[PDB]
Design a protein around this ligand. Structure first.
Ligand code: CLA
Ligand code: CLA
Ligand code: CLA
Ligand code: CLA
Ligand SMILES: C=Cc1c(C)c2cc3nc(c4c5[nH]c(cc6nc(cc1[nH]2)C(C)=C6CC)c(C)c5C(=O)[C@@H]4C(=O)OC)[C@@H](CCC(=O)OC/C=C(\C)CCC[C@H](C)CCC[C@H](C)CCCC(C)C)[C@@H]3C
Ligand SMILES: CCCCCCCCCCCCCCCCCC(=O)OC[C@H](CO[C@@H]1O[C@H](CO)[C@H](O)[C@H](O)[C@H]1O)OC(=O)CCCCCCCCCCCCCCCCC
Ligand SMILES: CCCCCCCCCCCCCCCCCC(=O)OC[C@H](CO[C@@H]1O[C@H](CO)[C@H](O)[C@H](O)[C@H]1O)OC(=O)CCCCCCCCCCCCCCCCC
Ligand SMILES: CCCCCCCCCCCCCCCC(=O)OC[C@H](COP(=O)(O)OC[C@@H](O)CO)OC(=O)CCCCCCCCCCCCCCC
Ligand SMILES: CCCCCCCCCCCCCCCC(=O)OC[C@H](COP(=O)(O)OC[C@@H](O)CO)OC(=O)CCCCCCCCCCCCCCC
Ligand SMILES: CC1=C(/C=C/C(C)=C/C=C/C(C)=C/C=C/C=C(C)/C=C/C=C(C)/C=C/C2=C(C)CCCC2(C)C)C(C)(C)CCC1
Ligand SMILES: CC1=C(/C=C/C(C)=C/C=C/C(C)=C/C=C/C=C(C)/C=C/C=C(C)/C=C/C2=C(C)CCCC2(C)C)C(C)(C)CCC1
Lengths: 31, 38, 482, 145, 45, 351, 35, 65, 73, 31
């Protein structure tokens, strides 16, 4: 059960990283 | 029910703040899960 | 569009909403007190008060109720192990229910003050704008606090109207809730003297009143008014954070080092009692006195109460613990059930050997049986290592005096080795480990958890004091105005 | 980390823990007396029982001869209640009930005719009180102040 | 036993130490201070 | 009514003192100076004297001084003996009895330096506040320094206070600090504590931010100078910034995936990372002060004990800690009077 | 009774008062001289 | 005049009533504390001396019959 | 706004307690009683030092024993 | 099902802050 929890947490971190990279709010404030 | 309070603003959270918070909570969970489960 | 961390600042001006918010916080804290009281009462096991006290069961708020006079319970039991016939209105359950009722009443008052925020009381007659006369408010509040402190010191602790407080013997064998007559001389300043409490709560009390009067009748100087920015509500926040910060360190230090307000019979022994051989020295002095009086060694060691021997055990040391070793002490090494007795080790020659006790630092310590001269005479190799002085070779034997295994002796090396490893922890003891499924690692007592939490909060509140003082002194720069 | 061991006499120690707890009271009191300290915790709830046992012993001594009917008069001079409440504190509503029943019964028997029945009831009461003191673990402290 | 075994090297080293220290202490202080005069000399507070 | 402004009353001695203190000279004294310059001075002095003449022979059984033949790396100002548990070690206190030589021998110089240094840190933080107020700036440097002062307070005062005495506080020296580090590794498993992990992340990320920011700013500069050297093509009175934020943002958004778009947020992040890391480290060491260490991983210990044929790097670290403790305790803690025979000293070949 | 430690502590109070007075007199004298 | 009214009100109420209540409470409590510390420090109950007979002999008197 | 957006609600307790929150901002001329505050601060610092040294065993008095053994009086 | 309380702690720590942040983001995004 612990392995599943660890894998889920790591997958969630990776998904957050991916979303931040690709689905970020556009930076028109300065550009 | 007496008079609307002029001091009534609204909290606002842009997307970058959301990503920062989610990353913080998930990374803290990653760090502390092994210790909590022993 | 306030950020998530500047949200509550919406209450920084209107006093009514501030009062409502503070009422909500008070209700939450009181409800927590009641809920923890109920939870611990549900989990508490009062059958054994000698080998299974409060501090071994992980209780936190129960000792704080007991320290001031709450002993009985509606379940018929008492914190003493006796049975109560007329618990009365003021029991553990009664106190918890009272706190819950107060939490609810404060919640209702909070919602009322939130609804009716605009009150004439908060507008000064001149300029008709919201304002608080902070010096006079402080005077009133200080007057009330001093009055309450004096009342507590002269009516509750001294026992003229109240029950008293928890006083115990130096070794924590027999303690109870008794009146505490004030002590005024220089002996009232060592915090191991309970009297010093009562006297304090009188003296300070009186001064409070006087101080309050002054702060009601004398206005601050203009230089002080502008220097400390007494017109802003944020300077008072900074000062109050500093005060609670200081109090947090003071209470944490008293809890860790010990005082008359933190008896070992409610919160458990301190690590400095194990380091300095307090209970060990007392036990040895009693055994030697009995021997000089003339008596058998078994008889001399059978007149030491189980409680005193239990205090002389490293497992009860608050220092031996872990940050993530959660739960009560019973869940670490099991529920104590009996005292095996004092173990005396004798080699084939006949000279008595003494086991080197484990220092607090060492998570694991090698076992060394050494004679009265400090010379190592036996030990156990690390792990299947070549041995020159070993239990098998030197042929040491363990004899038990007092306790359950009174008069028995062992010679087989396996049992002597096991009891030698058990002995370095202090007095040998017998543990039921199958009830709570205890893993086998030492846990920390309420002392350690209290001290850790409050020192951490003290540091965080130092940072808070710095930040809020900076935001007070630099108000104009932060606001970007003249 | 410490291992299991502990064999299986843990059941033996845990089964009769109440008797050891009762017996430890005398050891603690002797420890305090030798240390020249004051218990100020168990002695306060023991002086009323001390006076009760003295008064009951005198009642028996002056009743056995049958020379005075005032046994009943001094038997219930507002001291039996204190003994009953402290005994209930020690044991609670089970042994204390028996002790109060016995003391009232012997008082009634003495008040009726001070006949052989009263003496038999007094002897039974003394035996029951001695057994209760032995069980409570205070037996070493009652006698001889 | 501990005792210095050199007799006259003390003065020879001390003269050089003082001569070097004077210059080495005056120069960097000058370099750092001149900008301090510049900054606090008309645009300060 | 009788209103009033600010400073509309007669002058006072305080006004003259304040005017003199807050002048414009080479060194800004200010009020905080009265607490900072003396204290800090003595601290430094103490240490230097401590590292030059006094010895730790009677406290630790060591020789730590230039007069005894030690380097700069090995010299130190050792902590007092464990017998002086938490005595503040005043020169006039019951221990030294007013004797300066015996005071130095007993180790009171360490307490002198530590206390005066703590008050010097307080004075320095107050000095930062005073300078910021004098120049009408937000005092974020005060918080950035609240970080190291918290670390110092924790390590040098709360840890020894929770332990048996000052003896276990760090001794002011290079090799002394290395001994402190190895002692924590052996006895507390400090590397496995989540809070030292957070502090390590903070510090390394701070270094990364510093390097990346410097490189990006120096490699997106605007060409406003004919010469091949770009340092002279700038004066403090510029109007526009000297580097292209748009180009840096695009570069780090195409190489890494995310990039800053706000100077204030970027520099505040640079401020935030180290402070948070060091505060977490301070909380961890406060926990260690009570021996509340992250050491167990109880499941791993149980599994390793059950079957010897199960070895993870955690178990090897535990064995290394056992070795460190056993082989160090003999001399690192002379007050214990420990004599471990070679038979019982842990060894790898005995596994 | 006045134990030696108490005497030393009182002397320490006197000495610290002297040091504070010295700092105060220094700042007072120099401030008055310059203004 | 707002401050005039406030000054009159404070000088009256918070100048007399607060002092009176504080003095009354402090005097009552300190008098009680002193009286109970100088008069009653130990609890005294029961009376009379009795050591002539002990329960054992009286019990031993009435078992033959 | 007029009188800070019309007068607030009036309650009997509000009128009773109004005097205690009316004179906001009133101050004394000059330094007032700051010297007494300094004197009391110094005395309090001395008191704190005394208790700290008593509880740190840097100031041994005859009456105090400073150990658990004082719990037996 | 091992360390039920640990699993509950982890789940709550992952859910409550996540739900709070998402609710705030949705509430502000309506503007
Ligand atoms: C300072 C306040 C304080 C103190 C000293 C204690 C002390 C104690 N409590 Mg109490 N408790 C408190 C506040 C406090 N509690 C509050 C506010 C609550 C309400 C939630 C409770 C509810 C509570 C219950 C329900 C129980 C206790 C129990 C205990 C005992 C076991 C030790 C412990 O807490 O677990 C060890 C502590 C920890 C593991 C916490 C580690 C602290 C780190 C620094 C936090 C890091 C958090 C991190 C950032 C996020 C992690 C995320 C991760 C979960 C995924 C001990 C006597 C138990 C007991 O034995 O009672 C019978 C028990 O059953 N407490
Ligand atoms: C008497 C205590 C006290 C009081 C009344 C306040 C009140 C205030 N603070 Mg201060 N503060 C305090 C203690 C206090 N603080 C301490 C101890 C610290 C050190 C950590 C700080 C650090 C601090 C900073 C750095 C800032 C404030 C700010 C503020 C204002 C907005 C509140 C806020 O952060 O948004 C509301 C915050 C949240 C809704 C987030 C809560 C999430 C937390 C982090 C985790 C959950 C907490 C948990 C449920 C309960 C913990 C209980 C524990 C305290 C025992 C408000 C006036 C802010 C301000 O106005 O300045 C511009 C600001 O920037 N405070
Ligand atoms: C502002 C500068 C400053 C500061 C903050 C300190 C602070 C400190 N010094 Mg340092 N020191 C300083 C300047 C300073 N010193 C200077 C200039 C010298 C050279 C002369 C020294 C020489 C020195 C030595 C040699 C030692 C210290 C020590 C200490 C510590 C003990 C403080 C103590 O008990 O003093 C006394 C504190 C007070 C007297 C507080 C003021 C209270 C006033 C006087 C109250 C008066 C009111 C009233 C009359 C009292 C009534 C009571 C009674 C008389 C009836 C402390 C960390 C000692 C230490 O701990 O080292 C390990 C130590 O050994 N310092
Ligand atoms: C990748 C490797 C790595 C890294 C990056 C770190 C990072 C850190 N460790 Mg380490 N650590 C590691 C591995 C690592 N650790 C390992 C493997 C071990 C073995 C267990 C340790 C054992 C260890 C211990 C035992 C401690 C740390 C601490 C720390 C923190 C130091 C904070 C600081 O600056 O304190 C140093 C800074 C101060 C004390 C501030 C005082 C600064 C004063 C005011 C300056 C004085 C003026 C001076 C005279 C001016 C001269 C300037 C001149 C030098 C140029 C930091 C988070 C410490 C910590 O923060 O704990 C709370 C600590 O106690 N770690
Ligand atoms: C090795 C670690 C380390 C050192 C040595 C250090 C040193 C310094 N940082 C300062 C500042 C700062 N440091 C900051 C953030 C940080 N600093 C960090 C880490 C360090 N910073 C970290 C990790 C951060 C991130 C949070 C900030 C934000 C500031 C400043 O604003 C300030 C500055 O202006 O820098 C230019 C200066 C403070 C001057 C001072 O002490 O005031 C005078 C007080 C004194 C002298 C009293 C100290 C006495 C000490 C405690 C006694 C021991 C002294 C002996 C010499 C010890 C020797 C020990 C041996 C091992 C060598 C000084 C140059
Ligand atoms: C978000 C919500 C969850 C957040 C995490 C909660 C904390 C971790 C709980 C892990 C766990 O399983 O606990 C498990 C434990 C209970 O653990 C069980 O307890 C039982 C009691 O009969 C027995 O002892 C069991 O054997 C034992 O396993 O629960 C708690 O400890 C709850 C209290 C939480 C901690 C309170 C003390 C905090 C002290 C420090 C505070 C300041 C910190 C400052 C830091 C900066
Ligand atoms: C953030 C704050 C930034 C500002 C801080 C600047 C530094 C302030 C000046 C330094 C103060 C040093 C105080 C020394 C106190 C002392 O020596 O205690 C030593 C004594 C205890 O002394 C011990 O007593 C034990 C019990 O008998 C044993 O006998 C020990 O042998 C004995 O040493 O404690 C005190 O007197 C102080 C108590 C109150 C203050 C506690 C401080 C925090 C305690 C933390 C506990 C562990 C967690
Ligand atoms: C006696 C010398 C050695 C000890 C000095 C200790 C510090 C005491 C002075 C602190 C001044 C801080 C100024 C900040 C920088 C500053 O300029 O602040 C200014 C502030 C108000 O100044 P004014 O409004 O009068 O200034 C008017 C114009 O100059 C503004 O531009 O002064 C104060 O707040 C005084 C507070 C005294 C409160 C402490 C009273 C004494 C406490 C006990 C002291 C015991 C030891 C004696
Ligand atoms: C008035 C002080 C003037 C400066 C004196 C010389 C300073 C340099 C000292 C170098 C070490 C030499 C040994 C001196 C030490 C020494 O010989 O003391 C001895 C002296 C008296 O002790 P006796 O020798 O009489 O004791 C003998 C036996 O009876 C002991 O049981 O102790 C004191 O009265 C306190 C002296 C403090 C001297 C230090 C002054 C600084 C005090 C702390 C200031 C705090 C300021 C806080 C501000 C907030
Ligand atoms: C209305 C009312 C009522 C009732 C009420 C009630 C029943 C209440 C309850 C209440 C409650 C029942 C409350 C509770 C609360 C709780 C709380 C408030 C908690 C808190 C917690 C915390 C805060 C935590 C924290 C933490 C943790 C988690 C651990 C460690 C870390 C930290 C510290 C972070 C009635 C009907 C009777 C009547 C009328 C009034
Ligand atoms: C006695 C004492 C005191 C005081 C003290 C002091 C204040 C001191 C000071 C001191 C000091 C103030 C010292 C200084 C020192 C210095 C040094 C020791 C230096 C060194 C240097 C070096 C070694 C260098 C090297 C180098 C260089 C840089 C150049 C070239 C290269 C080389 C690397 C070679 C008192 C009475 C208060 C108290 C008690 C103690």
């Amino acid at each position: 059960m612990e392995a599943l929890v660890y894998t889920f947490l790591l997958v969630g971190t990776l998904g957050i990283i991916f979303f931040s990279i690709f689905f970020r709010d556009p930076p028109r404030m300065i550009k | 029910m007496a008079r609307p309070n002029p001091n009534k603003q609204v909290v606002e959270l842009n997307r970058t703040s959301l990503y920062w918070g989610l990353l913080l909570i998930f990374v803290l969970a990653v760090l502390f899960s092994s210790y909590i489960f022993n | 569009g306030l950020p998530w961390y500047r949200v509550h600042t919406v209450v920084i001006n209107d006093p009514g909403r501030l009062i409502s918010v503070h009422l909500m916080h008070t209700a939450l804290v009181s409800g927590w007190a009641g809920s923890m009281a109920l939870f611990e009462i549900s989990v508490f096991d009062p059958s054994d008060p000698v080998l299974n006290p409060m501090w071994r069961q992980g209780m936190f708020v129960l000792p704080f109720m007991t320290r001031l006079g709450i002993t009985q319970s509606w379940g018929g039991w008492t914190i003493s192990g006796e049975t109560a016939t007329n618990p009365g209105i003021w029991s553990y359950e009664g106190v918890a229910a009272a706190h819950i009722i107060l939490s609810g009443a404060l919640f209702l008052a909070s919602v009322w003050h939130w609804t009716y925020w605009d009150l004439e009381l908060f507008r000064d007659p001149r300029t008709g704008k919201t304002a608080l006369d902070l010096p006079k408010i402080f005077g009133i509040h200080l007057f009330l606090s001093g009055l309450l402190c004096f009342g507590f010191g002269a009516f509750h602790v001294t026992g003229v109207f109240g029950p008293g407080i928890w006083v115990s013997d130096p070794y924590g064998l027999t303690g109870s809730v008794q009146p505490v007559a004030p002590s005024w001389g220089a002996d009232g300043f060592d915090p191991y003297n309970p009297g010093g409490i009562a006297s304090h709560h009188i003296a300070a009390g009186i001064l409070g009143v006087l101080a309050g009067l002054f702060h009601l009748c004398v206005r601050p100087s203009i230089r002080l008014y502008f220097g400390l920015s007494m017109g802003s509500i944020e300077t008072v926040l900074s000062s109050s954070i500093a005060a609670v910060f200081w109090a947090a360190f003071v209470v944490a230090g008293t809890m860790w080092y010990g005082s008359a307000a933190t008896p070992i019979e409610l919160f458990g022994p301190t690590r400095y009692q194990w380091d300095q051989g307090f209970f060990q020295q007392e036990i040895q002095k009693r055994v030697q006195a009995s021997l000089a009086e003339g008596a058998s060694l078994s008889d001399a060691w059978s007149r030491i109460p189980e409680k005193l021997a239990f205090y002389d055990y490293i497992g009860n040391n608050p220092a031996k613990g872990g940050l993530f070793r959660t739960g009560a002490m019973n869940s670490g090494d099991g529920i104590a059930v009996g005292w095996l007795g004092h173990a005396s080790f004798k080699d084939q020659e006949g000279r008595e050997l003494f086991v080197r006790r484990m220092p607090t630092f060492f998570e694991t310590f090698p076992v060394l049986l050494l004679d009265k001269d400090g010379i190592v005479r036996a030990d156990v190799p690390f792990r299947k290592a070549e041995s020159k002085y070993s239990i098998e070779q030197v042929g040491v034997s363990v004899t038990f005096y007092g306790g359950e295994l009174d008069g028995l002796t062992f010679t087989d090396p396996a049992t002597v080795k096991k009891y030698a490893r058990k002995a370095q922890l202090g007095e040998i003891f017998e543990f039921d480990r199958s009830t709570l499924q205890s893993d086998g690692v030492f846990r920390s007592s309420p002392r350690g958890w209290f001290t850790f939490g409050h020192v951490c909060f003290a540091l965080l509140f130092f940072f808070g004091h710095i930040w809020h003082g900076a935001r007070t002194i630099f108000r104009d720069v932060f606001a970007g105005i003249d | 980390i410490p291992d299991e061991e502990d064999e299986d006499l843990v059941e033996k120690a845990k089964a009769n823990r109440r008797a050891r707890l009762a017996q430890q009271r005398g050891v603690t009191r002797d420890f305090m007396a030798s240390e020249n300290l004051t218990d100020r915790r168990l002695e306060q709830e023991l002086v009323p029982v001390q006076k009760a046992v003295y008064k009951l012993a005198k009642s028996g001594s002056q009743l056995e001869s049958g020379d005075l009917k005032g046994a009943a008069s001094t038997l219930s001079e507002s001291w039996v209640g204190d003994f009953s409440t402290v005994a209930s504190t020690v044991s609670g509503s089970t042994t204390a009930g028996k002790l109060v029943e016995a003391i009232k019964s012997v008082q009634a028997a003495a008040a009726k005719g001070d006949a052989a029945g009263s003496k038999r009831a007094y002897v039974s009461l003394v035996s029951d009180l001695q057994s209760w003191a032995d069980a409570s673990g205070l037996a070493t402290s009652l006698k001889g102040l | 036993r501990a005792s210095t075994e050199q007799t006259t090297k003390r003065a020879m080293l001390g003269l050089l130490a003082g001569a070097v220290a004077g210059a080495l202490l005056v120069a960097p202080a000058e370099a750092i201070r001149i900008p301090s005069h510049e900054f606090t000399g008309g645009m300060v507070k | 009514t009788i209103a009033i402004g600010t400073y509309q009353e007669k002058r006072t001695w305080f006004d003259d003192a304040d005017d003199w203190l807050r002048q414009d000279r080479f060194v800004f004294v200010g009020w905080s100076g009265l607490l900072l310059f003396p204290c800090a001075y003595f601290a430094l002095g103490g240490w230097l004297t401590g590292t030059t003449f006094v010895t730790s022979w009677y406290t630790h059984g060591l020789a730590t001084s230039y007069l005894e033949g030690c380097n700069f790396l090995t010299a130190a100002v050792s902590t007092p003996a464990n017998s002086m548990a938490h005595s503040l070690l005043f020169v006039w206190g019951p221990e030294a009895q007013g004797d300066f030589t015996r005071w130095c021998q007993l180790g009171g110089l360490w307490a002198f330096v530590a206390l005066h240094g703590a008050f010097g840190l307080i004075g320095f933080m107050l000095r930062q506040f005073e300078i910021a107020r004098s120049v009408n700036l937000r005092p974020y440097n005060a918080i950035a320094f609240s970080a190291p002062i918290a670390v110092f307070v924790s390590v040098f005062l709360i840890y020894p206070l929770g332990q048996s005495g000052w003896f276990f506080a760090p001794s002011f020296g290079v090799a002394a600090i290395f001994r402190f580090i190895l002692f924590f590794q052996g006895f507390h498993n400090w590397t496995l504590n989540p809070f030292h992990m957070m502090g390590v992340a903070g510090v390394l990320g701070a270094a990364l931010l510093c390097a990346i920011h410097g490189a990006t700013v120096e490699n997106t500069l605007f060409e406003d100078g004919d010469g091949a050297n770009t340092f002279r093509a700038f004066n403090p009175t510029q109007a526009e910034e000297t580097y292209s934020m748009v180009t840096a943002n695009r570069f780090w958004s195409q190489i890494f995936g995310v990039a800053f778009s706000n100077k204030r947020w970027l520099h505040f992040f640079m401020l935030l990372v180290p402070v948070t890391g060091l505060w977490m480290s301070a909380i961890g060491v406060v926990g260690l002060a009570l021996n509340l260490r992250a050491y167990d991983f109880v499941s791993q210990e149980i599994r390793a004990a059950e079957d010897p044929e199960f070895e993870t790097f955690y178990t090897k670290n535990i064995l290394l800690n056992e070795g460190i403790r056993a082989w160090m305790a003999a001399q690192d803690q002379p007050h214990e009077r420990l004599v471990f025979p070679e038979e019982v000293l842990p060894r790898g070949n005995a596994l | 009774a006045v134990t030696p430690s108490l005497k030393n502590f009182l002397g320490s109070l006197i000495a610290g008062a002297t040091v504070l007075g010295g700092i105060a007199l220094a700042i007072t004298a120099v401030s008055k001289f310059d203004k | 005049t707002s401050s005039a009214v406030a000054s009159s009100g404070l000088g009256g109420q918070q100048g007399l009533g607060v002092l009176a209540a504080a003095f009354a409470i402090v005097a009552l409590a300190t008098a009680g504390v002193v009286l109970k510390q100088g008069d009653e420090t130990l609890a005294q109950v029961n009376n009379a001396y009795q050591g002539d007979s002990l329960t054992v002999i009286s019990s031993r008197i009435a078992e033959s019959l | 706004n007029s009188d800070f957006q019309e007068p607030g609600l009036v309650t009997p307790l509000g009128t009773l307690l109004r005097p205690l929150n009316s004179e906001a901002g009133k101050v004394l001329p000059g330094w007032g009683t700051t010297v007494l505050m300094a004197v009391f601060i110094l005395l309090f610092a001395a008191f704190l030092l005394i208790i700290l040294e008593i509880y740190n065993s840097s100031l041994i008095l005859d009456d105090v024993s400073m150990s658990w053994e004082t719990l037996a009086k | 099902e091992v360390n039920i309380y640990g699993l509950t702690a982890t789940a709550l720590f992952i859910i409550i802050p996540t739900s709070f942040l998402l609710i705030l983001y949705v509430k502000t995004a309506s503007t």
